[PDB]
Amino acid sequence: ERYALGGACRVLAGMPAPLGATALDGGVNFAVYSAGASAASLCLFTPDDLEADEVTEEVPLDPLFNRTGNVWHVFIEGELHNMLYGYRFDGMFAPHCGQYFDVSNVVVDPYAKAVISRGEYGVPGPGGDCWPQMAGMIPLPYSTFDWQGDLPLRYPQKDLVIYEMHLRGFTKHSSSNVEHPGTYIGAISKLDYLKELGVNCVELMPCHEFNELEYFSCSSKMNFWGYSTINFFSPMIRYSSGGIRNCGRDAINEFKTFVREAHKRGIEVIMDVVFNHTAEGNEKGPILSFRGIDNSTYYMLAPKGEFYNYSGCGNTFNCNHPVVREFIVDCLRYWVTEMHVDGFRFDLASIMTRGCSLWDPVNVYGSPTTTGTPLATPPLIDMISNDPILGDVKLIAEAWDAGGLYQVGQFPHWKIWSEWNGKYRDIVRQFIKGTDGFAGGFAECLCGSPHLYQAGGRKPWHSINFVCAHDGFTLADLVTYNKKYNSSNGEDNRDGENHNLSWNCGEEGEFAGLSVKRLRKRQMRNFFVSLMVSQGVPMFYMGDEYGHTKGGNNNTYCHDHYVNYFRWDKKEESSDLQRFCSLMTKFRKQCESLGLADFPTAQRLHWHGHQPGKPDWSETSRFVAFSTKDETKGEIYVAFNASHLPAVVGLPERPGYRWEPLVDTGKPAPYDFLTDDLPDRAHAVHLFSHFLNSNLYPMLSYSSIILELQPD
Amino acid sequence: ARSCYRFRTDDDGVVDVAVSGEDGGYAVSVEVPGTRGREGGLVLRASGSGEGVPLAPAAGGASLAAELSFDPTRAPFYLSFLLTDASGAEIRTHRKTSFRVPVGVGPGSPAPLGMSISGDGAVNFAVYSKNANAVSLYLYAAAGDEPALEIDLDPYIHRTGNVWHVSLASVDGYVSYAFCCGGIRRPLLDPYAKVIGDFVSSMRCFASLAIAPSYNWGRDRHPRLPLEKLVVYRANVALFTKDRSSGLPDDAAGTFTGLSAKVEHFRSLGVNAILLEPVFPFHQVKGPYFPYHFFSPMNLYSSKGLSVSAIKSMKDMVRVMHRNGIEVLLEVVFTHTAEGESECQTISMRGIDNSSYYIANGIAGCKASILNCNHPVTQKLILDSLRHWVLDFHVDGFCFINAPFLVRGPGGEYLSRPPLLEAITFDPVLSMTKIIADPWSPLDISNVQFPFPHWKRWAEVNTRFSIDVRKFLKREALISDLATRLCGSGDLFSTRGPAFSFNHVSRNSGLSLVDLVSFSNDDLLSESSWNCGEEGPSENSAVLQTRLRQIRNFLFILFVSLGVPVLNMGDECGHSAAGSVSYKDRGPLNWRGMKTTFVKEVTGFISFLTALRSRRGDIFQRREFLKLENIHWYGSDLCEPGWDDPTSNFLCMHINAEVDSVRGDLYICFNANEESVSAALPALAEGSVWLRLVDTSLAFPGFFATVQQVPGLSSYHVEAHTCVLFESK
Ligand SMILES: OC[C@@H]1O[C@@H](O[C@@H]2[C@@H](O)[C@H](O)[C@H](O[C@@H]3[C@@H](O)[C@H](O)[C@H](O[C@H]4[C@H](O)[C@@H](O)[C@@H](O[C@H]5[C@H](O)[C@@H](O)[C@@H](O[C@H]6[C@H](O)[C@@H](O)[C@@H](O[C@H]7[C@H](O)[C@@H](O)[C@@H](O)O[C@@H]7CO)O[C@@H]6CO)O[C@@H]5CO)O[C@@H]4CO)O[C@H]3CO)O[C@H]2CO)[C@@H](O)[C@H](O)[C@H]1O
Ligand SMILES: OC[C@H]1O[C@H](O[C@H]2[C@H](O)[C@@H](O)[C@@H](O[C@H]3[C@H](O)[C@@H](O)[C@@H](O)O[C@@H]3CO)O[C@@H]2CO)[C@H](O)[C@@H](O)[C@@H]1O
Ligand SMILES: OC[C@H]1O[C@H](O[C@H]2[C@H](O)[C@@H](O)[C@@H](O[C@H]3[C@H](O)[C@@H](O)[C@@H](O)O[C@@H]3CO)O[C@@H]2CO)[C@H](O)[C@@H](O)[C@@H]1O
Ligand SMILES: OC[C@H]1O[C@H](O)[C@H](O)[C@@H](O)[C@@H]1O
Ligand SMILES: OC[C@H]1O[C@H](O)[C@H](O)[C@@H](O)[C@@H]1O
Ligand SMILES: OC[C@H]1O[C@H](O)[C@H](O)[C@@H](O)[C@@H]1O
Ligand SMILES: OC[C@H]1O[C@H](O)[C@H](O)[C@@H](O)[C@@H]1O
Ligand SMILES: OC[C@H]1O[C@H](O)[C@H](O)[C@@H](O)[C@@H]1O
Ligand SMILES: OC[C@H]1O[C@H](O)[C@H](O)[C@@H](O)[C@@H]1O
Ligand SMILES: OC[C@H]1O[C@H](O)[C@H](O)[C@@H](O)[C@@H]1O
């Protein structure tokens, strides 16, 4: 018989599953896996005490009654929802052997649903401490969120337009005019703008708990993007206006609210998860959750206890260890069932293919494949693909890592996984900028990359086509700068991709002549048209719809200022590009033959050159044109002229029919895209009728056109 | 008490349908918020009937709405409707469907898989089926034949990914449930059901809606006996006590209660671990080795013949064993089931989703359905089963029958990295339970001899031990084989230790001890048995004496080798199988023989051997192989044995008791030759003399002395077909 809170609360044995704090039978059951721990205790804090970094109560755990196998567990009766909890593990400290146990450390449960350390973004703790004590939120015996009947949209992936967005940056600028800039609630008031922009899916950049001040104590930098996760079950409490209120519960609810609103406006949510490493870094980094529990289990280690570094961020998560596999699958299932997330994009997903040391013939068979070797059927990806729940959500993969592994088109997929098509990005960037030998590759890109995904049994929409992302040049920087300008990152301009495949369209920098500026507008529209007429899923980063510029900096991971913010005041200045992008997305939605469920066939899709039926596939070609039969548009003719020369291109001869102009990126706005909202659309068409009557169209250099076959 | 459903329309809008039960009918409130797309008002065409209940401004005109009511006592049903604006145009979901909502059943939750009871009292059902695109729940009340209630599940509301789910206000008046998948009206058994009904052959079983009452384990604790200090005794729950000679009441014999009633018999032999044969529910035709279900014990092993009584009785038996210091080990078959390819055999998961749970077309030469053990869904099912049997029934270990099969992938290939075995080995909950790999397969397809992975954690049943010992006693093996098997079979368990070698000389299948010495014909050549001069039972006194000596030698070799001796049921009392090598021919254990002198000799010898193992734990109950300085091999007279000489069926071990309290050396002579042989005893220090503890050529009073004294360097005369054990004092 034992009692915890000064005699008020009772302490029972508990049960080993499910892992993490769970409200049950008038109390809370805690369970945590630790193989190397010889002793363990549960440390309970009150919020004010945690502010002071002091343990309000400490319940030791008996290795006889409070441990089943390698799972410590303890049950406590009472109303613990208003406290926070952590663990204190005693074992062997041996960095050379991979052990890091130390009783002076209180660690956060990996299964904790909210990690309460600080409340305000960028505000250190009491004394400038960027790494104050952290604790986990103890659940209530009931859920306090009304989903209002929310149901999963389950949009077919061929019908998706994806909008990569930073949660804080989306509304943190003063021009957003939102009640709470830089939070979930603040972003809720712009989902209408997203819906009118044509987007029906938002890829949130990492919203898992992370420390924005990990680069701040040394140096004076921030961690804006958040690609170093502390807790995987927990949302970022500094992205919510509540902060650490009600032990973080409010923050949780706020995230939920955002999701709900997105689904009320017909927008799916895809979370960017980073399972390939942790904020604890190498041996020199802080001990927060995993290193103090089981470092040898949760991290890849060479025989001498050194940390394998395939993520490039200090450590590598032991993704394919059975325990870590179960943990990751549980985390994804929690985000899908509890938080109603529609899909996940996996950062450096190739690290999840590398095997673990458990299969080294020393461990199995006792004596003489090794750690970090890519696998044909990795157990973790097998578990995700064939999971009852996760099997039917979006599973996008960034198929590469910092260790030199590159698996675009080859990521173990089970005919389920999608991928960030980096080859599409490279080929489109190189063709649209006027490079030799990319007409055939560009045509393959326009067809959903059949040479990558068709052989393996996947469809065109398993290819996530994108030209720009959070890392790399923005769409406007892609046509403004030839080389990166990362001196502000502080690392002597050593950061980011060195092979950008970009072109300044003549002069470099934002101060150029009128011709260069018009060419840049043309190029931005050409990139968007290529993205919106290709087979696959078009993904673009936030701000590319109005021409967001980061000043040539292609790696802004450590900047909490307007360089990474959505500029709502600059959106109005460049509303012409936003209008063109919205109209292009709507045009893609209307066309029956652009979001195809299967790869285009020669019956529907015909390839042309400057003359119909005679495409130029040679290395000198810089022109790609095609015509596609459409069940709603009749027929659409698309053409890209990436050459530096204008061309009067002949159009296919369709007796009894005429080609009616729709899109021309060279035209001045609003005539770059013709809609019925222009009172003088008919006059504009008539002014080119003398070319369209003889089946011709005059195209400028570096420009694209789209025409529709109307009866005549 | 309400449930909201927020349908996304196909004209950029939302439709909220709230279903509220009445304190009896139901109220369905439809609400269209927003504007523009519905400019002019709209009407709720419920199934397109002449009705339509026009929506009237409910909230400030922004929220248009309508309210419908449905009569009480109506079974769960589906309200399907469309919306038509004030121009004739229709309005549909974003999937181009008519807004359909359930009435009488809530949405449900995807977890936990199976049947759950919520805090309110609502019963949640969840089942995984990727192949199916239409699932329905049948509820049967007390007798029923046809479902008392049928609830079809809407693929859009009652489904998260590939997990169909549905919640019910209550199940009062209902006793069982089943699932219909695809559209075929055959009920199916929930894989995750913890309580099930009685099998009925087409095949039919139903998961019970009753929840197993909380079991009071009291001060029950896992024995946690070290693997080295283990003496196993395999037993069949039915055959162990179902014979009237056991002296138990009817309906108590052949059950778990009968098993626990003989704990004194188990203790008398020095046993501290009982290895039960498969207790999963199984088809009566195929036998215990073809299970239908993986989460409860078989109801035939309960006094009342029910599954709940079975759970209670098995937990009681485990409690008794644990409080008596005896571990419980379950033989578990996770490589196949009793389900068939056809639809009549399908019961549980060959119907729900047989593409996930089973291999394509199974294997060659085997009708039994081969489980897709390494498919993640099947991995989860098996792991949940093991965790249930450990955390719920307090089981101490598992002996995985047909363990090699578990390494094969979906295509029948052999996986270099079997995921299921890795998951079992590193499961946090199961880290303290014993896991034993059993190469024997109930099927008719021998798989392969290959390096089963162990991670220095898996024990293995050593059939090679049986074969080599049988051959040596049959005079068709080199003494090197006996030397290898006596020292712990280090060739196989070099990196693990002798304790990981589960030695045996007789199994539930094959020939028993009394059948290895009596039945030896052309068909039984695979058993490496010797008839001792006359096939079948005989009266020739010399033959019977030879058979008794052979039985003693078998037990002696089993209990003096390094490893865990595994004693089959009935070996201690000459449970003859009548010359059959099939486990299905084994019968009830005849307990009367326990009062005979033959069984007296056998049980006393086994008890003496176990006591010798316990007392001299530094020799037999070791975690590591004996050093290659405290073991010596000798022949007729302290000489090099003929290792490569096939005609020499004699051998002697000298074990130096490493005194790192004093210890006495040991000297063991094995003579399978048809003729006697001299044995020169080793040299002992002054004042120490050999004690003849074991001699298998003598009568019961003197067969196993707790004693005759012999000076060092003496010369004993080992009779033909005998084993001798001396210990220096
Ligand atoms: O997978 C993501 C991938 O990249 C994305 O974008 C990238 C993004 O993930 C990152 O921002 C990334 O930045 C990386 C770093 O991640 C990484 O560290 C990298 O290399 C080095 C780096 O030079 C050092 O960090 C190095 O050693 C440090 C340890 O790793 C670290 O654990 C540190 O630990 C603590 C330290 O001991 C201490 O200073 C402490 O700070 C103070 C405390 O207040 C307290 O101790 C007090 O007493 O005093 C100290 C101050 O003295 O806190 C530290 C940790 O918080 O110790 C070492 C530092 O000495 O390790 C790594 C090895 O790799 O450097 C940068 C380079 O960028 O780059 C982004 C690139 O884009 C996306 O682009 C992409 O989508 C995605 O795939
Ligand atoms: O490519 C030679 C060809 O075209 C020339 O015009 C432009 C090219 O078409 C265009 O690609 C661009 O070249 C840039 C590359 O795209 C890019 O790698 C970059 O970073 O550097 C190159 C320019 O510095 O610009 C050229 C014009 O500057 C040219 O007009 C033609 O005569 C020639 O045949
Ligand atoms: O028309 C349907 C067809 O479209 C696509 O095939 C085209 C390729 O995308 C495109 O690269 C090009 O292929 C040619 C090479 O560029 C050229 O080097 C040469 O050797 O001939 C190739 C083809 O003859 O043109 C083809 C169509 O002609 C798509 O990939 C196909 O899946 C689809 O069937
Ligand atoms: O390793 C080669 C590849 O590495 C990266 O993942 C880059 O995104 C890609 O452009 C490059 O070709
Ligand atoms: O394209 C993304 C770039 O950053 C990544 O983190 C990869 O490690 C690198 O290969 C790639 O070039
Ligand atoms: O040197 C650090 C580098 O690590 C990564 O591989 C990123 O791709 C790159 O952007 C970053 O600068
Ligand atoms: O199995 C025993 C065989 O191998 C051994 O190491 C010894 O040399 C001898 O005992 C025999 O040759
Ligand atoms: O000792 C008898 C034999 O036993 C074993 O199998 C080893 O090979 C060695 O110990 C010896 O050959
Ligand atoms: O694997 C080790 C083998 O040889 C050794 O020397 C041991 O003494 C013996 O127990 C075993 O047969
Ligand atoms: O136990 C004695 C051991 O010594 C040896 O050198 C080996 O480890 C093994 O063959 C032997 O069993």
Side-chain angles (χ1 to χ4, degrees), chain A residues 16 33 64 69-71 148-149 151-155 264-266 325 358-359 363-365 367 382 386 388-389 392, chain B residues 4 6 8 14 94 128 155-156 159-163 221 376-377 391 417-418 422 426 428 431 451 453-455 495:
Chain A
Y33 155 88
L64 240 66
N70 291 147
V71 173
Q148 300 174 0
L151 294 173
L153 297 160
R154 301 182 208 164
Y155 291 152
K264 211 181 130 277
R265 295 153 172 69
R325 279 192 262 137
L358 288 186
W359 282 111
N363 287 326
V364 62
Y365 307 125
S367 324
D382 185 47
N386 298 300
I389 300 293
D392 268 21
Chain B
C4 290
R6 166 164 289 165
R8 181 80 186 160
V14 177
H94 65 294
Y128 161 80
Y156 182 69
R159 222 198 61 207
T160 308
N162 295 307
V163 175
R221 297 287 299 171
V377 178
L391 295 172
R417 299 158 146 253
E422 193 189 12
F426 296 96
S431 277
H454 45 95
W455 287 274
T495 55

Side-chain angles (χ1 to χ4, degrees), chain B residues 130-316:
Chain B
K130 186 178 183 180
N131 175 58
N133 38 33
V135 173
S136 82
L137 176 73
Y138 292 168
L139 297 183
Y140 305 72
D145 292 344
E146 292 313 61
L149 173 68
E150 308 175 351
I151 298 163
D152 170 89
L153 306 189
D154 181 78
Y156 182 69
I157 288 164
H158 296 113
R159 222 198 61 207
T160 308
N162 295 307
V163 175
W164 302 77
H165 49 74
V166 62
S167 60
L168 263 49
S170 66
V171 295
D172 300 355
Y174 301 104
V175 290
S176 73
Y177 72 92
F179 288 99
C180 150
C181 292
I184 302 163
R185 310 285 322 298
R186 191 155 302 297
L188 301 173
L189 174 59
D190 193 357
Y192 277 85
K194 303 305 187 300
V195 187
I196 63 166
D198 281 77
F199 289 117
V200 171
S201 178
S202 166
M203 252 310 260
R204 184 219 89 171
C205 195
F206 306 127
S208 176
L209 286 163
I211 308 299
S214 174
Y215 180 83
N216 175 73
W217 284 102
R219 305 283 314 171
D220 194 74
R221 297 287 299 171
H222 286 290
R224 298 290 180 81
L225 305 173
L227 188 64
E228 55 263 12
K229 302 151 89 311
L230 202 67
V231 181
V232 179
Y233 182 100
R234 185 187 290 103
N236 194 321
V237 173
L239 306 175
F240 184 54
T241 46
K242 76 182 292 189
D243 208 271
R244 284 191 176 283
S245 53
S246 71
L248 300 172
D250 285 358
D251 303 327
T255 73
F256 297 114
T257 309
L259 174 65
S260 74
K262 302 296 186 181
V263 87
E264 287 306 319
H265 174 64
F266 286 107
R267 275 172 52 98
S268 287
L269 294 164
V271 172
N272 59 7
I274 78 193
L275 176 62
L276 306 178
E277 313 209 346
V279 299
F280 296 168
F282 63 87
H283 207 185
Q284 273 306 333
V285 172
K286 286 179 184 180
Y289 291 100
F290 297 78
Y292 281 130
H293 191 247
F294 296 129
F295 282 99
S296 67
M298 159 87 153
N299 55 41
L300 263 282
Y301 301 135
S302 80
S303 279
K304 297 174 183 177
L306 292 213
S307 74
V308 180
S309 53
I311 288 165
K312 185 177 184 296
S313 40
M314 155 158 248
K315 287 185 176 182
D316 295 333

Side-chain angles (χ1 to χ4, degrees), chain B residues 534-552:
Chain B
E534 185 162 0
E535 213 284 348
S538 186
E539 313 57 14
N540 183 308
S541 49
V543 171
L544 310 210
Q545 293 168 56
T546 278
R547 286 175 172 174
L548 182 65
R549 292 225 206 105
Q550 286 300 74
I551 291 164
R552 295 163 167 180

Side-chain angles (χ1 to χ4, degrees), chain A residues 114 226 252 469 529 685 689:
Chain A
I252 283 166
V529 170
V685 177
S689 71

Side-chain angles (χ1 to χ4, degrees), chain A residues 555-696:
Chain A
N555 197 212
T556 55
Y557 73 99
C558 58
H559 292 287
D560 186 35
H561 73 278
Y562 58 85
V563 79
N564 285 321
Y565 293 171
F566 195 113
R567 302 295 305 278
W568 300 91
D569 64 314
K570 286 211 131 303
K571 180 175 77 69
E572 313 299 25
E573 297 183 4
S574 324
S575 57
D576 50 83
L577 180 59
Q578 202 261 142
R579 173 189 175 270
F580 179 91
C581 296
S582 176
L583 286 168
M584 274 307 310
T585 302
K586 215 223 290 168
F587 175 64
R588 176 186 189 83
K589 197 224 164 124
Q590 285 161 353
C591 287
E592 197 271 319
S593 76
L594 288 180
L596 286 182
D598 261 294
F599 290 96
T601 173
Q603 302 308 318
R604 169 203 291 286
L605 174 70
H606 306 275
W607 294 98
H608 313 296
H610 290 165
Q611 301 299 315
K614 303 205 172 263
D616 189 1
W617 299 123
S618 69
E619 154 159 88
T620 60
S621 176
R622 295 190 185 183
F623 178 93
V624 173
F626 61 94
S627 75
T628 326
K629 292 284 291 269
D630 206 295
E631 288 47 17
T632 36
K633 306 292 186 181
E635 196 164 6
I636 80 173
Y637 173 89
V638 187
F640 303 85
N641 185 32
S643 72
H644 66 292
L645 294 175
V648 183
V649 309
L651 316 170
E653 331 278 332
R654 303 286 176 267
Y657 289 83
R658 200 192 118 151
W659 291 106
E660 210 218 313
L662 182 64
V663 178
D664 192 7
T665 66
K667 293 267 172 57
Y671 305 105
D672 53 2
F673 200 118
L674 298 177
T675 69
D676 283 332
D677 306 31
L678 302 181
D680 57 8
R681 180 185 183 181
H683 198 217
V685 177
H686 173 75
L687 288 167
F688 278 74
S689 71
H690 72 295
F691 269 103
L692 296 152
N693 287 342
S694 50
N695 285 317
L696 297 167

Side-chain angles (χ1 to χ4, degrees), chain B residues 483-484 487 490 628 631 633 643:
Chain B
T484 297
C487 296
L628 216 171
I631 70 90
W633 303 99
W643 298 110

